[PDB]
């Protein structure tokens, strides 16, 4: 359990921060066979000071489908496997939903990759100051805050408060029930439920504009200013749809803060 | 990646040595250097790892006419380091010219540990502002490592000289070094002597031997600020992602520091957050207010209580601050360190952009101006006269810091759609 916590849910530093950073350099027309990144996996555990365990083996990182191909795609699945007398408790259906939340957090990692890219892209042009440089850099700082908002929500619910439970629940059917409740709360706190589906749908529209901000270098400034305006437009709509869904939740109560401090 | 630290000044070399003593107490090594088998932790970003069982800290030890470095030798930590970089003025310009004439061999010492490690992230400069031997030389190497490597990060550990008026040449020196820190460093961690002296007189009964106590206070701060990097967290556990959240404007990179145990010689999170926001637990000395705050926690912390605690400060109206952006207050969590005696289990950090420090700056911008009217306190050194015959570079630096003060005063208000 505390191994899959470090593997798929990614509570391991310099393991996520070595995998996604290495992988996004390549992409696609490359990285189409799972025989290199499945060995980069074994190199990333050594960089995380958690490897060489028996949990480090029986892992598998592969593509479930070759794409036909700005791109936000994710179809790369990490899996952890267990032997026969423990397979009856850790079933084949729980590992599929573990990979289902893994793809979501991997899509979160591309944001911190591309935002770092535009951060460095604006760092390299810094001589003398100019109005064009500062008024563009503030959009990057602005977008950065909203990702530290959604990350602070996830770092409270899925990794941490359901980690208080499943620590005082594991004291033969009981263990399987405990494991099922941990996963079922992890997907409900993951905002993949149909109740919070309008909350989830706008996050993709946020991600798309940040990648459109990433590709670009007035040089092009008005086209990016419009993108930042569409960004604040979508977020101010998000502030209303999160309030409507607490007027008609204990886990959603954490959100309508994080998006808004000391402001109307 | 790996981070190289450089310490100069006698006071800077002292606090760097005490900092490595604190980390030797922290990390799984003995005071000879030999590994202890009691130990999770990473000793790679600040310690070069051979198999000589004495892991050498990644420090560059430079000096001028070594006096206190002899006292650094007579210690059980003389087997922790020997990279052979010890080499034998009074003003910024004299120290700058003395750093100018010997730049090749000290930069060879820099190129040595640059080629020694393969991954490189950042340079920490342990330096005292207007410190004599530190001033001039530190600004010179600051200019040179930023000019030579634009792909790395530059951080500085720096104290502020304040004695409430004696050295008459200090506003010139601090003025020039502040220009060099604003244009040749990406982030500056600012401390002053006066607030730590005030807190030290609050906790203890000290008047004369203050230096030996405030060094301990500083070292506790610098170890605490590195606990999130040395022990693997998942938020800002590299230097780059840490500094990328703290800068809303590229002229503002000065970070306010606090520490929730004011004395160490049960708790829930709302308690330490509210104790944290108080100005007495702050270590750095009209409406002046924060732009954005990051607070870092270390201890036995339940995850749901931090959400309630942040909700509490939201309800208190302790947020009487108002910049022009929605970039907000920030919480982070890291673990309390094992492996050492750990009293006062839950302890806090703050990393914040506050404009009250601009008052401190304009005090220097006051003082130099008065001396500029008198023209009897420049002390007329010969290398100072040859380095600048008209002394208009101090006037240009005064212009730059005046623009810095105007940008601060524009950043205070919620109206920064126009440049200040």
CSV table of N, CA and C in Angstrom, one decimal, chain A residues 5-6 10-14 17 47-49 109 116 119-120 123-124 127-131 134 137-138 141-142 144-146 148-149 151 155-156 160-161 164 228 250 253-255 257-258 260-263, chain B residues 1 40-42 150-151 183 232-235 237-238 240-241 244-251 302-304 306-308 310-311 313-314 319-322 324-331 333 407 416 419:
chain,number,residue,atom,x,y,z
A,5,UNK,N,1.4,3.9,-3.1
A,5,UNK,CA,1.3,5.3,-2.7
A,5,UNK,C,2.5,6.1,-3.3
A,6,UNK,N,3.7,5.5,-3.3
A,6,UNK,CA,4.9,6.2,-3.9
A,6,UNK,C,5.0,6.0,-5.4
A,10,UNK,N,2.1,8.9,-6.8
A,10,UNK,CA,3.3,9.7,-6.9
A,10,UNK,C,3.5,10.5,-5.6
A,11,UNK,N,3.6,9.9,-4.5
A,11,UNK,CA,4.2,10.5,-3.3
A,11,UNK,C,5.7,10.2,-3.2
A,12,UNK,N,6.4,10.2,-4.3
A,12,UNK,CA,7.9,10.0,-4.3
A,12,UNK,C,8.5,11.2,-5.1
A,13,UNK,N,9.4,11.9,-4.4
A,13,UNK,CA,10.1,13.0,-5.0
A,13,UNK,C,11.3,12.5,-5.8
A,14,UNK,N,11.7,13.2,-6.9
A,14,UNK,CA,12.7,12.8,-7.9
A,14,UNK,C,12.4,11.5,-8.6
A,17,UNK,N,9.4,13.7,-10.7
A,17,UNK,CA,10.3,14.8,-11.2
A,17,UNK,C,11.5,14.3,-12.0
A,47,UNK,N,17.1,7.2,-8.5
A,47,UNK,CA,17.3,8.6,-8.3
A,47,UNK,C,16.3,9.1,-7.2
A,48,UNK,N,15.4,8.3,-6.7
A,48,UNK,CA,14.4,8.6,-5.7
A,48,UNK,C,14.8,8.1,-4.3
A,49,UNK,N,15.8,7.2,-4.2
A,49,UNK,CA,16.3,6.6,-3.0
A,49,UNK,C,15.2,5.8,-2.3
A,109,UNK,N,0.9,16.7,-14.3
A,109,UNK,CA,2.4,16.9,-14.4
A,109,UNK,C,2.8,17.7,-15.7
A,116,UNK,N,6.8,25.7,-16.6
A,116,UNK,CA,8.3,25.8,-16.4
A,116,UNK,C,9.0,26.2,-17.7
A,119,UNK,N,8.4,29.7,-18.3
A,119,UNK,CA,9.1,30.5,-17.3
A,119,UNK,C,10.6,30.7,-17.7
A,120,UNK,N,11.2,29.6,-18.1
A,120,UNK,CA,12.6,29.7,-18.6
A,120,UNK,C,12.7,30.4,-20.0
A,123,UNK,N,12.7,33.8,-18.9
A,123,UNK,CA,14.0,34.1,-18.2
A,123,UNK,C,15.1,34.4,-19.1
A,124,UNK,N,15.2,33.8,-20.2
A,124,UNK,CA,16.4,34.0,-21.1
A,124,UNK,C,16.5,35.3,-21.8
A,127,UNK,N,20.6,43.3,-19.2
A,127,UNK,CA,20.3,44.3,-20.3
A,127,UNK,C,19.5,45.4,-19.7
A,128,UNK,N,18.2,45.5,-19.9
A,128,UNK,CA,17.3,46.5,-19.4
A,128,UNK,C,15.9,46.0,-19.5
A,129,UNK,N,15.0,46.6,-18.6
A,129,UNK,CA,13.6,46.2,-18.6
A,129,UNK,C,12.9,46.9,-19.7
A,130,UNK,N,11.7,46.4,-19.9
A,130,UNK,CA,10.8,47.0,-20.9
A,130,UNK,C,9.3,46.6,-20.5
A,131,UNK,N,8.4,47.4,-20.9
A,131,UNK,CA,7.0,47.2,-20.5
A,131,UNK,C,6.5,45.9,-21.1
A,134,UNK,N,7.5,42.6,-18.8
A,134,UNK,CA,6.9,42.5,-17.4
A,134,UNK,C,5.4,42.2,-17.6
A,137,UNK,N,5.1,38.6,-18.5
A,137,UNK,CA,5.5,37.7,-17.4
A,137,UNK,C,4.4,37.6,-16.3
A,138,UNK,N,3.6,38.6,-16.1
A,138,UNK,CA,2.6,38.5,-15.1
A,138,UNK,C,1.5,37.5,-15.4
A,141,UNK,N,3.0,34.2,-14.0
A,141,UNK,CA,2.8,34.2,-12.5
A,141,UNK,C,1.4,34.0,-12.1
A,142,UNK,N,0.4,34.6,-12.9
A,142,UNK,CA,-1.0,34.4,-12.6
A,142,UNK,C,-1.5,33.0,-12.8
A,144,UNK,N,0.3,30.4,-12.8
A,144,UNK,CA,1.0,29.5,-11.9
A,144,UNK,C,0.3,29.4,-10.5
A,145,UNK,N,-0.3,30.5,-10.1
A,145,UNK,CA,-1.1,30.4,-8.8
A,145,UNK,C,-2.3,29.4,-8.9
A,146,UNK,N,-3.0,29.4,-10.0
A,146,UNK,CA,-4.2,28.5,-10.1
A,146,UNK,C,-3.8,27.0,-10.1
A,148,UNK,N,-1.1,26.0,-8.4
A,148,UNK,CA,-0.8,25.7,-7.0
A,148,UNK,C,-2.1,25.7,-6.1
A,149,UNK,N,-3.2,26.2,-6.6
A,149,UNK,CA,-4.5,26.0,-6.0
A,149,UNK,C,-5.0,24.6,-6.2
A,151,UNK,N,-3.4,21.9,-7.0
A,151,UNK,CA,-2.5,21.0,-6.4
A,151,UNK,C,-2.6,21.0,-4.9
A,155,UNK,N,-3.5,17.7,-2.7
A,155,UNK,CA,-2.6,17.4,-1.6
A,155,UNK,C,-3.3,17.4,-0.2
A,156,UNK,N,-4.5,17.8,-0.2
A,156,UNK,CA,-5.3,17.6,1.0
A,156,UNK,C,-6.2,16.4,1.0
A,160,UNK,N,-3.9,12.4,1.6
A,160,UNK,CA,-3.6,12.8,3.0
A,160,UNK,C,-4.7,12.6,4.0
A,161,UNK,N,-6.0,12.9,3.7
A,161,UNK,CA,-7.0,12.7,4.7
A,161,UNK,C,-7.7,11.3,4.7
A,164,UNK,N,-5.3,9.3,6.7
A,164,UNK,CA,-5.5,9.2,8.1
A,164,UNK,C,-6.4,7.9,8.3
A,228,UNK,N,-5.1,35.0,-21.9
A,228,UNK,CA,-5.2,35.3,-20.5
A,228,UNK,C,-6.5,35.8,-20.1
A,250,UNK,N,-19.0,18.2,1.5
A,250,UNK,CA,-17.9,18.3,2.4
A,250,UNK,C,-16.6,18.3,1.7
A,253,UNK,N,-16.2,21.6,-0.4
A,253,UNK,CA,-16.0,22.8,0.5
A,253,UNK,C,-14.5,23.2,0.4
A,254,UNK,N,-13.6,22.3,0.2
A,254,UNK,CA,-12.2,22.7,0.2
A,254,UNK,C,-11.8,23.5,-1.1
A,255,UNK,N,-12.6,23.4,-2.1
A,255,UNK,CA,-12.2,24.0,-3.4
A,255,UNK,C,-12.5,25.5,-3.5
A,257,UNK,N,-12.8,27.7,-1.3
A,257,UNK,CA,-11.7,28.5,-0.9
A,257,UNK,C,-10.7,28.6,-1.9
A,258,UNK,N,-9.8,27.6,-2.1
A,258,UNK,CA,-8.5,27.6,-2.7
A,258,UNK,C,-8.4,28.5,-4.0
A,260,UNK,N,-10.0,31.2,-4.3
A,260,UNK,CA,-10.4,32.6,-4.0
A,260,UNK,C,-9.9,32.9,-2.6
A,261,UNK,N,-8.9,33.7,-2.4
A,261,UNK,CA,-8.5,34.3,-1.1
A,261,UNK,C,-8.6,35.8,-1.1
A,262,UNK,N,-9.2,36.3,0.0
A,262,UNK,CA,-9.2,37.7,0.3
A,262,UNK,C,-9.7,38.6,-0.8
A,263,UNK,N,-10.8,38.1,-1.4
A,263,UNK,CA,-11.3,38.7,-2.7
A,263,UNK,C,-12.8,38.3,-2.8
B,1,UNK,N,18.8,19.7,-9.1
B,1,UNK,CA,20.1,19.3,-9.3
B,1,UNK,C,21.0,19.8,-8.1
B,40,UNK,N,15.1,8.4,2.7
B,40,UNK,CA,14.6,9.3,3.7
B,40,UNK,C,15.3,10.7,3.6
B,41,UNK,N,16.6,10.7,3.6
B,41,UNK,CA,17.4,11.9,3.5
B,41,UNK,C,18.3,11.8,2.3
B,42,UNK,N,18.6,13.0,1.7
B,42,UNK,CA,19.5,13.1,0.6
B,42,UNK,C,20.7,14.0,0.9
B,150,UNK,N,24.3,31.9,-17.5
B,150,UNK,CA,22.9,32.4,-17.4
B,150,UNK,C,21.8,31.3,-17.2
B,151,UNK,N,22.2,30.0,-17.2
B,151,UNK,CA,21.3,28.9,-17.1
B,151,UNK,C,21.1,28.5,-15.7
B,183,UNK,N,20.4,43.3,-10.0
B,183,UNK,CA,20.6,43.0,-11.4
B,183,UNK,C,21.5,41.8,-11.6
B,232,UNK,N,13.0,14.9,0.8
B,232,UNK,CA,12.1,15.0,-0.4
B,232,UNK,C,10.7,15.3,-0.1
B,233,UNK,N,10.3,16.6,-0.4
B,233,UNK,CA,8.9,17.0,-0.5
B,233,UNK,C,8.5,16.9,-1.9
B,234,UNK,N,7.3,17.4,-2.2
B,234,UNK,CA,6.9,17.3,-3.6
B,234,UNK,C,6.5,18.6,-4.1
B,235,UNK,N,6.6,19.7,-3.3
B,235,UNK,CA,6.3,21.0,-3.7
B,235,UNK,C,7.5,21.8,-3.4
B,237,UNK,N,10.6,21.4,-4.0
B,237,UNK,CA,11.7,20.7,-3.5
B,237,UNK,C,13.0,20.8,-4.4
B,238,UNK,N,12.8,21.6,-5.5
B,238,UNK,CA,14.0,22.2,-6.2
B,238,UNK,C,14.0,23.7,-6.0
B,240,UNK,N,14.3,26.0,-8.3
B,240,UNK,CA,13.7,26.7,-9.4
B,240,UNK,C,12.2,26.9,-9.2
B,241,UNK,N,11.5,25.8,-8.8
B,241,UNK,CA,10.1,25.8,-8.5
B,241,UNK,C,9.8,26.6,-7.3
B,244,UNK,N,10.1,30.3,-8.4
B,244,UNK,CA,9.2,30.6,-9.5
B,244,UNK,C,7.8,31.0,-8.9
B,245,UNK,N,7.5,30.7,-7.6
B,245,UNK,CA,6.2,31.1,-7.1
B,245,UNK,C,6.3,32.4,-6.3
B,246,UNK,N,7.5,32.8,-5.9
B,246,UNK,CA,7.7,33.9,-4.9
B,246,UNK,C,7.8,35.2,-5.6
B,247,UNK,N,8.1,35.3,-6.9
B,247,UNK,CA,8.4,36.5,-7.6
B,247,UNK,C,7.2,36.9,-8.4
B,248,UNK,N,6.4,38.0,-8.0
B,248,UNK,CA,5.4,38.5,-8.9
B,248,UNK,C,5.8,39.6,-9.8
B,249,UNK,N,7.0,40.2,-9.5
B,249,UNK,CA,7.6,41.2,-10.3
B,249,UNK,C,9.1,41.1,-10.3
B,250,UNK,N,9.7,41.2,-11.5
B,250,UNK,CA,11.2,40.8,-11.5
B,250,UNK,C,12.1,41.8,-10.8
B,251,UNK,N,11.6,42.9,-10.3
B,251,UNK,CA,12.4,43.8,-9.4
B,251,UNK,C,12.3,43.4,-8.0
B,302,UNK,N,-1.6,17.1,11.1
B,302,UNK,CA,-2.8,16.4,10.4
B,302,UNK,C,-3.2,17.2,9.2
B,303,UNK,N,-3.6,16.5,8.1
B,303,UNK,CA,-3.8,17.2,6.8
B,303,UNK,C,-5.0,18.0,6.7
B,304,UNK,N,-6.1,17.6,7.4
B,304,UNK,CA,-7.3,18.3,7.3
B,304,UNK,C,-7.3,19.6,8.2
B,306,UNK,N,-4.9,21.8,8.4
B,306,UNK,CA,-4.3,22.9,7.7
B,306,UNK,C,-5.4,23.6,6.9
B,307,UNK,N,-6.3,22.9,6.3
B,307,UNK,CA,-7.4,23.5,5.5
B,307,UNK,C,-8.3,24.3,6.4
B,308,UNK,N,-8.6,23.8,7.6
B,308,UNK,CA,-9.4,24.6,8.6
B,308,UNK,C,-8.7,25.8,9.0
B,310,UNK,N,-6.3,27.6,7.4
B,310,UNK,CA,-6.3,28.6,6.4
B,310,UNK,C,-7.7,29.3,6.3
B,311,UNK,N,-8.7,28.5,6.5
B,311,UNK,CA,-10.1,29.0,6.6
B,311,UNK,C,-10.2,30.0,7.8
B,313,UNK,N,-7.8,32.0,9.1
B,313,UNK,CA,-7.1,33.3,8.9
B,313,UNK,C,-8.0,34.0,7.9
B,314,UNK,N,-8.7,33.3,7.0
B,314,UNK,CA,-9.6,34.0,6.0
B,314,UNK,C,-10.8,34.6,6.8
B,319,UNK,N,-6.1,39.4,7.0
B,319,UNK,CA,-5.7,39.8,5.7
B,319,UNK,C,-6.2,41.2,5.4
B,320,UNK,N,-5.4,42.2,5.9
B,320,UNK,CA,-5.6,43.6,5.7
B,320,UNK,C,-4.6,44.1,4.6
B,321,UNK,N,-4.2,43.1,3.8
B,321,UNK,CA,-3.3,43.4,2.7
B,321,UNK,C,-4.0,43.3,1.3
B,322,UNK,N,-3.6,44.1,0.4
B,322,UNK,CA,-4.3,44.2,-0.9
B,322,UNK,C,-3.4,44.6,-2.0
B,324,UNK,N,-2.5,43.8,-6.3
B,324,UNK,CA,-3.3,44.0,-7.5
B,324,UNK,C,-3.6,42.7,-8.2
B,325,UNK,N,-3.1,41.6,-7.6
B,325,UNK,CA,-3.3,40.3,-8.2
B,325,UNK,C,-3.9,39.3,-7.3
B,326,UNK,N,-4.5,38.2,-7.8
B,326,UNK,CA,-5.1,37.2,-7.0
B,326,UNK,C,-4.2,36.2,-6.5
B,327,UNK,N,-2.9,36.3,-6.8
B,327,UNK,CA,-1.8,35.5,-6.2
B,327,UNK,C,-1.8,35.6,-4.7
B,328,UNK,N,-2.0,34.5,-4.0
B,328,UNK,CA,-2.5,34.5,-2.7
B,328,UNK,C,-1.5,34.0,-1.7
B,329,UNK,N,-2.0,33.8,-0.5
B,329,UNK,CA,-1.3,33.2,0.6
B,329,UNK,C,-1.1,31.7,0.3
B,330,UNK,N,0.0,31.1,0.7
B,330,UNK,CA,0.5,29.8,0.3
B,330,UNK,C,0.9,29.0,1.6
B,331,UNK,N,0.3,27.8,1.7
B,331,UNK,CA,0.8,26.8,2.7
B,331,UNK,C,1.6,25.7,2.0
B,333,UNK,N,3.8,21.8,3.3
B,333,UNK,CA,4.0,20.9,4.4
B,333,UNK,C,5.3,20.0,4.1
B,407,UNK,N,9.0,51.6,-7.8
B,407,UNK,CA,8.4,50.4,-8.1
B,407,UNK,C,7.8,49.7,-6.9
B,416,UNK,N,-1.3,48.6,-10.3
B,416,UNK,CA,-0.1,48.4,-11.1
B,416,UNK,C,-0.3,48.0,-12.5
B,419,UNK,N,3.1,51.3,-15.1
B,419,UNK,CA,4.4,51.2,-14.4
B,419,UNK,C,4.7,52.3,-13.4
